[PDB]
């Protein structure tokens, strides 16, 4: 038989999936859009340097391009994000002067554009696009290197770092296949909701979608039943987040701040891929330790929702965390 609150989760899922980039014209289309605009605007910003703009590679990233996109809360934004691998040499051209040309390129298109110590974002009416920007590993040694650094960064912060995103997203596309996949990116969507509708007073404090992903792609573990009689299997999405938040809690570790004289509870989540670094290290220890407590919140209300006797009272205590699109069947 069917798990407890198994259909209010699909359900759930059914309300906050955002499809793909291969299902969602309308993200395309987006998509597409900035990068004309980028590649007339580069045409434009090397007017004035005697030589054709040099040519790019776009190419899908982050969660549009995974399948583990969510659609945002009521005033939120789409976040598109994109590589785009310029047909240039890293060590000929500083990080910063390239993100530069490409924010210049988006100078006069919607709301702006910035330059990020990662990217280059250009705004919109309701979006926003991610350009993560690196050069041609055929001229930079076989290496594909992010431009890293902004002009407040300085000297010592601006750099090509070495970055693999299409490792990452295969990676995730690769942990597990069918069905067993499918409730992977579930967990991983549910726990995007939980954080836009649990971390909304402070979206700098928010756990990023990357480390739920990292963190999915370190501890997930399928849950699920195959009948003794008809080999038919039912899938537990309850009891597949109780095991991961339960991993990723015991993952925690206390780590000693010496200006605050005291230690915050971290949880490190390295990249699988290059540059394999810590996806939460940006977050503060005191982001950290409410990042925890709010886990644990979510787990025990995970518990409570196995054991109640009405259906109501359990999915009501799981839409305390994951917000109002998550079904409270009446009792
Ligand atoms: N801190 C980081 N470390 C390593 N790679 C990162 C980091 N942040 C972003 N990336 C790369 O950029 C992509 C887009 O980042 P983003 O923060 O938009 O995550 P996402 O997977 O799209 O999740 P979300 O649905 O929350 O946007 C990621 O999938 C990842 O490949
Ligand atoms: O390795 C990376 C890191 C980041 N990115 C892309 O750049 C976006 C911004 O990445 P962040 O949210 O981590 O901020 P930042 O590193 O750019 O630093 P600040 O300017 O906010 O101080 C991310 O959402 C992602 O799409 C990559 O493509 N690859
Ligand atoms: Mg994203
Ligand atoms: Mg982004």
Redesign the pocket.
């Known amino acids: 038989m069917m798990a407890p609150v198994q259909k209010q989760f699909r359900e759930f899922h059914d309300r906050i999936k955002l499809a793909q980039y291969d299902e969602n014209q309308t993200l395309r289309d987006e998509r597409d859009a900035v990068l004309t605009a980028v590649r007339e605007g580069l045409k434009k910003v090397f007017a004035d340097r005697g030589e054709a703009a040099p040519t790019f590679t776009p190419f899908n990233?982050?969660?549009?391009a995974?399948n583990?996109?969510?659609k945002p809360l009521e005033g939120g934004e789409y976040?598109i994000?994109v590589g785009i691998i310029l047909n240039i040499a890293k060590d000929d051209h500083d990080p910063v002067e390239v993100k530069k040309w490409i924010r210049d390129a988006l100078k006069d298109y919607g709301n702006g554009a910035e330059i990020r110590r990662?990217c280059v974002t250009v705004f919109k009416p309701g979006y926003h696009v991610?350009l993560?920007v690196y050069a041609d590993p055929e001229l930079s040694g076989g290496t594909l290197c992010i431009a890293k650094g902004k002009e407040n960064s300085g000297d010592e912060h601006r750099l090509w770092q070495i970055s693999d995103?299409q490792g990452?997203?295969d990676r995730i596309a690769s942990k597990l296949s069918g069905d067993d996949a499918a409730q992977f990116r579930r967990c991983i969507r549910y726990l995007?909701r939980w954080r836009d509708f649990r971390f909304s007073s402070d979206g700098n404090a928010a756990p990023?979608?990357?480390?739920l992903?990292a963190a999915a792609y370190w501890w997930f573990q399928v849950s699920k039943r195959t009948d003794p009689v008809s080999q038919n299997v039912t899938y537990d999405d309850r009891d597949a987040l109780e095991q991961f938040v339960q991993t990723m809690l015991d993952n925690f570790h206390d780590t000693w701040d010496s200006k605050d004289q005291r230690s915050y509870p971290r949880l490190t989540v390295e990249?699988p891929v290059q540059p394999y670094?810590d996806?939460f290290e940006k977050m503060t220890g005191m982001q950290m330790e409410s990042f925890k407590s709010k886990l644990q919140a979510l787990l025990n209300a995970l518990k409570t929702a196995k054991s109640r006797l009405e259906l109501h009272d359990a999915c009501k205590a799981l839409a305390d965390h994951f917000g109002s699109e998550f079904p409270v069947p009446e009792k």
């Open positions: 990233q982050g969660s549009y995974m583990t996109g969510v976040d994000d990662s991610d993560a995103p990452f997203q995007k990023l979608g990357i480390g992903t990249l670094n996806v």
